[PDB]
Amino acid sequence: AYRIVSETGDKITVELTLANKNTHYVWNGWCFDIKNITFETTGKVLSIKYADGGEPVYNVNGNLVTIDLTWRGIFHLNTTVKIIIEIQKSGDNPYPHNFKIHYLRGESIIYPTIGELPASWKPGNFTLSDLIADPKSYYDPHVKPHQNGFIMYNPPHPTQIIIGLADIDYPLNLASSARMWVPNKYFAMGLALAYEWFKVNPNFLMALAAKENWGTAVTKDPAFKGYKVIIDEEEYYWPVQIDHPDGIFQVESGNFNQIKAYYPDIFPDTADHDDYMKVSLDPNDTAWITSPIVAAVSLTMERELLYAAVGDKYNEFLRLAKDPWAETEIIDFGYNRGVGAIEALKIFSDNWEKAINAEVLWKEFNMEGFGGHVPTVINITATMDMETERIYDANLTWDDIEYFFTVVRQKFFRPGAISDEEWNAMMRDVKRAYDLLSQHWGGDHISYRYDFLTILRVAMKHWPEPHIPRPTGDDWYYHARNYNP
Amino acid sequence: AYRIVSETGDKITVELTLANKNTHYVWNGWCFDIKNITFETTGKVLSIKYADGGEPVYNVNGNLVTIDLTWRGIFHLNTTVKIIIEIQKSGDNPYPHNFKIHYLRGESIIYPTIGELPASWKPGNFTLSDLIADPKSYYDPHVKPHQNGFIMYNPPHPTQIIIGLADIDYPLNLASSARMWVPNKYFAMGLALAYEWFKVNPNFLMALAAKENWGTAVTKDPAFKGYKVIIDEEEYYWPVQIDHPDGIFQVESGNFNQIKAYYPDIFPDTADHDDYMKVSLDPNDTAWITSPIVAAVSLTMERELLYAAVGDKYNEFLRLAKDPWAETEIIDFGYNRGVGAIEALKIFSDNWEKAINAEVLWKEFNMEGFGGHVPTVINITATMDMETERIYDANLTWDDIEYFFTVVRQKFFRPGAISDEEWNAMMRDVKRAYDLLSQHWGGDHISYRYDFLTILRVAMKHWPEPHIPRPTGDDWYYHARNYNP
Ligand SMILES: CC(=O)N[C@@H]1[C@@H](O)[C@H](O[C@@H]2O[C@H](CO)[C@@H](O)[C@H](O)[C@H]2NC(C)=O)[C@@H](CO)O[C@@H]1O
Ligand SMILES: CC(=O)N[C@@H]1[C@@H](O)[C@H](O[C@@H]2O[C@H](CO)[C@@H](O)[C@H](O)[C@H]2NC(C)=O)[C@@H](CO)O[C@@H]1O
Known part of the structure; x- marks a missing residue:
């Protein structure tokens, strides 16, 4: 004033x-x-x-x-x-x-719209038509290949989640071959929320976990001792270190501590690194849900930091760079080597022309990361994006959905963001949407692939706006004001 | 009560x-x-x-x-x-x-006493004998080799600082050889404060910076371009990335954020990563003083976390392990791969016997770190420890001492720890000790090697007790309570 x-x-x-x-x-x-x-x-x-x-x-x-x-x-x-x-x-x-x-905070940051509930939707006594705009498109099994990297600027479908469980010919972690797999449906629901909330491509998080700790890939390579997983009558090894405190994304406690500081709207003060990241063979371990959301926020932080520092130049770089995977390469490199290492490349200042003219940015700038991190993650994301034959799907029951949102309520948001009454009203709407959508499949479940984004959107109609909060607080302030990439 | x-x-x-x-x-x-x-x-x-x-x-x-x-x-x-x-x-x-x-916080944590001022010493008009208990040993140039790793349990001298500028035959960062080098005297004084305050061996920080970013070593190897550095009659390459935001110790912003959170007694809320870590060829860059102290606090955090989680088992491990460099290998591994990675090893629980019986711990447990981190740092630290012929020394003027303490005042402690009048009383004692100690040299300077630890002890008589604060706050609480190594 x-x-x-x-x-x-x-x-x-x-x-x-x-x-x-x-x-x-x-x-x-x-x-x-x-x-x-x-x-x-x-x-x-x-x-x-x-x-x-x-x-x-x-x-x-x-x-x-x-x-x-x-x-x-x-x-x-x-x-x-x-x-x-x-x-x-x-x-x-x-x-x-x-x-x-x-x-x-970059005023021009792009967060794409994946899809939206019909404009006729309102809380309470909505109907099936208030959920599904176009049934033929909503249930269409045909898969449109795409090439999105980290951010889903061009979603292959507005209401379907398409995780492509492709065979991988790239030598992942020195194995001769691999196959992508989703360890359980609670993990799949966490990927879906990362996608709808932060616009992160589920295939990119899948690729990232596979490189970091085999979280999402198995192999027939007999050099690679691991847990035995039988998939339609074939034996695979799952070379994950499943009890690693940093989880399948290998998020360390320093980075966790920092994104907690930056995001008081997302993380309560109680949030603890090993509790959020460390999974196990038990599919009920709550870190199966929290850890892909934590990884998405960590990645989001890098993107937000770049935007806060360079403003309009970030979208100008996306428009001009010759390497169409440039953004994804920068963000993946920063994930593995840190935002200091991005900053040192000077892509957005001293080395601008070299950066936008590079046909393969990571080769020109020596941004491989450790263990071939960048080319591995980018290759697997691209391969999954092209997959049309084998797409993940799962039956979700009401108990599954209820469990998912209980964990979300326990682990994310701070008291005062969503009241008990608001949360209860939200869950009535979610249950009603589940009930209507279940009818298509015989009433005993909904589909992860076809229905779960609509369930998320129903829930999110009740979430505080804007849904993505600004990074903020003292640490963010000094770090982002002093960042010159 | x-x-x-x-x-x-x-x-x-x-x-x-x-x-x-x-x-x-x-x-x-x-x-x-x-x-x-x-x-x-x-x-x-x-x-x-x-x-x-x-x-x-x-x-x-x-x-x-x-x-x-x-x-x-x-x-x-x-x-x-x-x-x-x-x-x-x-x-x-x-x-x-x-x-x-x-x-x-581990109640039995060991912080060795390097040396102490004579019991006669008091603020105000103290005398030379109040500073130097034993002139003959104080000025003795004879060097006793030692084998301290990270923590200086058995200091080779109580009042002299011995940084051994050894020639290195270990293939440091793939170079055929190298030479340890202190880039300037302000960095030397920061190492000295890390040593007196946190009991960290200066050779270990020298080794660490050399492996991380060539911060403290130069080389004849031509394969390795770098800044041209002349020492006496000899020319070398200094392959440091001197403008890296993470500095010569490669401390990243997430780890920096975390130690700020853990150590409100050491870092003011204004402390900024790039400001504390990023050095330059200018010796007056304040990060030459702050960054070795930050690296020391970061290593200290790892040891404090292990003591907090396992209590008396820590000292028992020190007592029993077959590898005399075990603790150093563990702390260095944690520095490079994180405390999650230490925890996954289960040295202190599941794999206890295997750990105390290993002749070379890091080989047994595959704790090399990236790029041969652990064997490089341990080998250089040991080689430096053994050096008796070429020991770092420098002339410090009063301007040098004043500047050093001015940076310490600006960058460490927070308001309320030491009043302006306490600080001014401290600087009078430091000035008087500088003048007293300069007499031996003809009055124009004091010696880093022979005098600076005594100067620091004089200042620290005026610092809050106990001089090492406990790690604390919310993040420490959840993390250390859940840590099971
Ligand atoms: C040459 C190669 O591909 N090595 C693989 C390693 O890269 C994998 O380890 C993981 O490597 C990333 C950096 O690439 C680290 O961020 C990550 O923490 C690390 N994962 C673990 C559990 O240490 C490794 C996975 O088993 O497999 C190959 O060795
Ligand atoms: C095989 C080998 O020795 N490579 C060296 C690298 O290890 C050095 O890079 C540094 O490596 C450590 C992990 O060992 C990283 O923590 C550190 O961030 C990294 N330093 C930089 C500036 O990226 C490298 C130093 O120039 O020299 C060899 O390549």
């Missing part, structure tokens, strides 16, 4: 008040991290100072003034900052106007 | 109050993380409940009662928890007694 304090002589004095007025947690408003504040004037800036002493930094570019709050840019609950701006009147638009708070 | 509320019949009722009574930050009292509370009674425990509802977990083992606060074990500023204990009177010592709060 802002106010003319006085206009006296040719001197215009304005007070700007910046605050987080929240006194208790609310969704997306627990902390605001301010990159800068802009405003316009044709007058001459005489001084910009804090009301309670000291002054921010500012610069003028034509009619555009940019205030940098430097050490004072972080706004926790109940925090107010008052700024006094003095202008010498001149020109045709001298009063400070068009104030914009710019958060430390 | 605790109190007998009533003794009535054979029923004794006790109220136990656990609190963090601090209302503002105080050294080592910002948060208390309680693993459990023990007390003794010959009586029979009837109940243990919280005064405001619900109850903790407790177990009885003979006369020893162990209360586990589970979700309530974290005590931030101004937090109180009240527990009601009911005992059925019996035996000769029925009243709850010998109450002990056990922090989530």
